[model samples]
Target: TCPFYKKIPGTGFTVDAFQYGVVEGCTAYFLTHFHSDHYAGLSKHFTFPVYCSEITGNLLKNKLHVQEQYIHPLPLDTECIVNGVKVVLLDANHCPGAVMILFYLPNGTVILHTGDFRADPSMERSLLADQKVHMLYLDTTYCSPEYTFPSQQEVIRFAINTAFEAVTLNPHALVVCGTYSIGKEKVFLAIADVLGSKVGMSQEKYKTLQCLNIPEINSLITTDMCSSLVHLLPMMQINFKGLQSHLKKCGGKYNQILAFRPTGWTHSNKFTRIADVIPQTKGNISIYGIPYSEHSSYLEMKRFVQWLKPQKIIPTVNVGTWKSRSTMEKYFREWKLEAGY
Candidate 1:
């Protein structure tokens, strides 16, 4: 019994349901992004018509080897009539290809499904302004009040500043950033440009990023470690033991390794200023846990829901436990009342 089944009640379309065998009536499958958890069930054998943004579609073909015939790359901000329902895709801001799907059902009910997103002021102002959303399927990743973190720009600036300071202290120190396959590009990208350095990444990740077709990203990344002192690797490999292995393998090139572990887990309520967040050091390895998250913070989620003022709100994530679901419902009510809806 999956609590977060992505089936749209009134339609035959499923959103991000690739993992659980295909739904009985699911005629079309909509993928919000290419993150592993979201696109887990999808495979080369998938027969359902898949709809997604162009960038995501590119990753599907290039990385997953999903066939192009079944993939439909939709243009953002343009409405398309599929199975007699109006569907529009808007940028999710969480990742490069991630999108928020807006569905206008046949019965005239408007539903918005935010697959995964980091909400900003611009989303409320232009992307979804003045729309009467009947039911909102939200990304409740950080729904609790305790999950407050700074904006992406603030964290990126902090990361850039920290890298600059680290390099200034030790001219040959290697700056490494732990990143996911598709997200957190802003952190290392910003750091590289600010430091006037190129980034070294695995050949697979470099190819994946190249699929995004951004010329600037194409220029910043390389597979040769010898070309750059800055590198990007998976989060699991950023730990002390992993960095020690990495340092020994390339120990002669640099004096020390400055690693960044960027995620919301690094944040705490006690952290008043960005610079106050400290790093854990062991000998030549230093790991800075930067509170850089792709998901919307609790306050940002509240602001988004209040602006949309959807008639009914549904938690799309963190619905496994009854206690968790109830806690989110309480906040939903409080936000709706605060919005004067």
Candidate 2:
């Protein structure tokens, strides 16, 4: 009943099922990253060994509680054999431990599955080196021209720098950040790394980020909002109600609530953004939404399609095409044809 169920040409039974992509008579499975949407029904109940990055494997064990032995780690840019298929893992640049999967089938077809990645320089270069792609499992989560969000690097930089600016302006206000359940760990680390202040998050968030072993996220404060602490809360936690509720505890010491929501939905054609200020109607407090999306925009999707030029495109998350002129592309250029086989 799924729109994506199909056979890989040249390889009779080689099915590239990601996000708990198990089908009848499927040989082996590959996971692009550790996003719940990608792993529909994955858990301890999962039987066959699932191949993924070391971070993903750790997440599977520590976060998802999957059997350790059932999770196999695929090193970055390194080649490994998966059920006789030669595979290489590339950094997807989405979140901690996300990887773009490349498969070399025995039937002489090359299949590339970009689990859920932002095809950065390295990914483009890697795929270009081989230049043979039969089927491409695309991450079309944001496959529309409506999304022209800035690069993740720029977004994080803005989040960190903007937070600093907000704190400086409202010296008495509590600085809080909005982030997803399992995404945007870097936003917190950036503030810690640059401002030399530990972010105040629950022990749970700290544990999840610590598993990444990134030194930048070295410290965090809990309970009391010490002078050197910046608060970290769920993205929605930065709402007016939460901020207002927090104000009561400040005992009138703080007059304002400054919060930031890092999301891809921030980008739009509605109004011009100055100082990258996020505007919304609901909150009375100072709040902004940062366009810190992990998914590739229309322009990015175009570049990926151009580079790989796979014979067949299978949308991963949803259906639709990214359309826009501002996307990082030129004249809707047609890709030079190549036989994947």
Candidate 3:
């Protein structure tokens, strides 16, 4: 059986075959995160047992709500051997269940796969001190010079300020911010922590967060009682008519309203065509864009690779053929090369 094969659409190789065909003898498959791109074709062909950290298993089962019997959950930082290949999971920290994997081949070749990791100093320091990684599969999603974003802390502060501005403009408005269920929860928590008032979440959102054991940062408000809030609508329930009806019920009495949504939801041109379909609402609906992403920036990718000192740096997720290949090539040039093909 072939240990590696060219990814059907491109020249690069994938460790174990997926979708195209299953490698006859591959014993284990390591999933770094639950993001669709990485795990999309798994159930299509491979029926072999798959391995991920405990949090990832819960995320796959509870968050994405996948029902698969082949999942084998292991703890973070623990090593496991499947069919003679050694694997270890490291904290990626891009999201609640993200992980970087280390694969040790029988020939003594070690490969570290950094799955959509960021270079937060605290996280980097810990990873650097832990082990001597050999080959590093990096996240190079933002490797282009034009791709830039403010720091995570800076983005958090901007979100807080934006929320405060909304409050000042209209005290009776209810504000809602939407983000990925996991990433947004933390952003809202940070906002509530800054505001000193409990930020409210819908019961469904609260239950989802609770199941994930997310620590509470604010009180919650459900959709049924949303009419009572003068200003904001939950991010999930954002619609023009519903927003106006809720505000009208409050009689234009609220001072501020805030709602959180991921940057692309309203801002992307794809949603622009449907903008009119949304119901009309009274009062101001401020959509604040806080730069919270689960992927690493260009500088962070460079920094992580430099620190890891790996023999070869491969990329995942963002490095598919057409659009991201240039980015991968740029990173490859910047990284220091070592001995390996």
Candidate 4:
């Protein structure tokens, strides 16, 4: 687990710290998103009143079974008073129900806690550009200068083209896309839309998608084994052995396998460009590790920091160790200097 800090400085509230139990002077608890890392330590038994976006509230009730009374669902892009402080939730562009929290203190202090975000272009048009943030709690998952993955749209296009071409060559090839419970929905959804094909998934995942209330998803997902060439499985199942076993279990519907492991971790400077990435093949299986990150890249974070120009910046991730924390702070200093803050 990453070393997560609870208390938001100069406030009487705690953010994403349910597991730490109650803290002194903490009148309310704030949840940024539904991701396990951010929502860890949360459960049905957590007694304190939790504040989050409306979508997250439904997820907590429907998924985790947290009582509705304790979960306060706030509307996005609207201001509400929480313990005498004005608060607003903005889309995080990370996953379903994820939000970046903005807090307006009584003393004219504005704090933005970006839970986990991709820093999409849409964020540039939000009210954030007009406000002067006092302190920014940022998602520094890829804080270093090394991470420079392609944009999400570019990566999605690459994935779609790669899958389409592979299937075109081998008509009966099984296209297995690896995904987490929620994060990588866009990749497979786009693939399904372009291919105009059904996607097979477990009943549990389908139910989870139902909670997301995604439009037309009902028409895309199916339970029949042989009906669709595309399937969604956990990331762990993308490996050779797992695919082979899964192939056998599917009753030999496909002659060959084409699996994609979409994530930012697959990216590195070693690949001179995005197009240079090649798939590994053996026997009847091919594996493509595509760079499809939900988190902001190094350049994206730099741009975000400069745009906000907050008086102080705080790193939320990669702070588990002394060296890692210092490295993140170094990047912060450079960005601050570049912005002339």
Candidate 5:
């Protein structure tokens, strides 16, 4: 029984074990989100039915090329039986279409797979009331005190305000908010709303945002970068090296792009203090590292488990031997020092 898969008592059935495995190997495959990490081994060849939230199902069919007949969108908050295992999905809060999967066993023991989520008060209370979970698969990306950062609520404010400061501070400088392909749509929208200007992204981002259906999102009016006050670029293109490379390679092409990356890495020990904005000008352009993240702060994760108190807490990560891996395991190992499993 690993973080990725666990065997059923007698059915000899396994869940999400997904070895080369895809959905076909498990009794039922529970996909928490469309993140490549979660769906790592998935493919068009899957035969067993795949269960997930609505957006995930659509992505499975359209993005992953999985057969529609093999996909089932698990209704939020509703319990259903799949391959003989009772299951329910809740909002994971990590990203759009992300879900927390609960596998209710017949023997009165329940397994909850968090699928990468931040804990919210009301949601925690609701689940605590059920008292059904015994084993928890947790997302422990930032399980260290060094991981200090504000919640998305305050982080969004920081991100927007910082970008505002940078853009308004300079006359010729242009604003660029870096983000991944999925998640962080709210960042762009919030900036657009505050600035009352359209944000620009690639065609792929535009299409993804189109699916989100924010009335103002259409205002994501295309950018000549040369035109838009703020241009939303991929994180891959906004870093210090990437920026210098862009300038060194294509000089007159870009305006002085001051990029903002809303991330937790800004709290690096390399810095003397945890500043709201960590700026690196090697960026040839200033890259503002804002402490914004989808994952819980280290303290939040500790508090969450302290309250939920699962019999066992399994960090949602593949087993590895890296030194960093040992540090992450230490976070969970300390939990074992508490009580129970």
Candidate 6:
């Protein structure tokens, strides 16, 4: 049997004996992030001592409901030895629990895996300082020429400002924003910090914020310490039919409302579809389309590879070589020459 499987044409690889393949003689198997694409198949077929950041572990357990027995948690920047390989986790800054893995093999080869990361200069500069990486497994999801995204700070600013303006215009409206339980806590926090006592989170959102160790927001809301703020805790289900009725009961006195969703209402055209399903009120509802993606764009991927000056680079995600393998091959050849590989 072929224990080490080759990559399939489109989807992913298949290990002949997955149970013993990944960790049979290896030191460790490190997961770079908690995205479904990264961890989907392996979780069910294989069971071994896996390592990831503590936040990732928390998300896997609390959010994704993965079994805790398999996870061996390590904090960011901390190094741990598995099967004799030194694996270091660094903050990826794409999502709350995402991380980029640096593998230092026992044979003195250092491989850096930039797992779906972006160019957050403030964070990346500090994380990668003085480290000479030899090989890089890059995330080249958006390596094509026709892709672009605003900076994270820019997106956050737009979201907050748009929400604030909406709230100001409608004094008696219930602002509902949709976000994933664990991933978009920062967006909520940013709104709260800016609006102070004028904001609320659902009970589920509150629970998530608590798990993130953001005690300041909790204390302010719980103690009713913030002035003139109405923060709604997270809810189990966001009732579309009774949303307006619930808002009226909860003292819907805000004129403008700010809301979010993970994927729905991404485009202006899609907003029409959402309105068709959820009844709208008389008050003005402005939808701010902010792209707060955690993954790196094509330019960011190019920049990362350029900075690392790696001897060889292989892309792991879709769009890297699948969509345009010829372009990738040319780039890889050029990169190899530049790297003197």
Scored by lDDT, the top model is: 1
lDDT of 1 by residue, 117-166 (tens): 98887886654675678988899999988888877778888888889989
For model 6, how does the per-residue alpha-carbon lDDT over 61-107 read when each residue is reduced to its tens digit? 66555678887788777767655556677887676667777766666
Residues 1-341 of candidate 3 have per-residue lDDT tens digits of 33232121111224333444564444555666655656666642345676776766776666555566777787777777665566777788677777776766666677676766776656565534666766666666667655555566665666667666666666565665554345445566666555545544556555455545454422433334433332233555565555545556555565445555544222332233321223233456544444466666666666666766776566655544775777576657656653122
TM-score of each model, in listed order: 0.96, 0.82, 0.72, 0.94, 0.82, 0.71
**CA lDDT, candidate 4, residue 17:** 75
**In model 4, where is the ten-residue run with the lowest total lDDT?**
1-10
* Backbone clash count, each prediction separately: 2, 4, 28, 0, 0, 31
lDDT of each: 0.85, 0.66, 0.56, 0.83, 0.68, 0.55
Locate the minimum summed-lDDT window of 10 residues in model 3. 4-13
TM-score of 2: 0.82
Best by TM-score: 1
Span of ten consecutive residues with least summed lDDT in model 5: 1-10
Error of 2 at 3 (Å): 5.5
Indicate the residue-level lDDT of 246 in model 4: 86
Quality of model 3 by C-alpha lDDT: 0.56
**Minimal lDDT window, size 10, model 6:** 8-17
Query: What does each candidate score in C-alpha RMSD?
Result: 1.5, 4.6, 6.9, 1.9, 3.8, 6.8
Point out where model 5 deviates above 4 Å. 1-19, 22-25, 212-216, 219-227, 244-255, 266-276, 282-284, 322-341
User: Candidate 2 residues 100-135, lDDT tens each?
Assistant: 777787878787777777766566666447657887
Decide which is better by TM-score, 1 or 3. 1
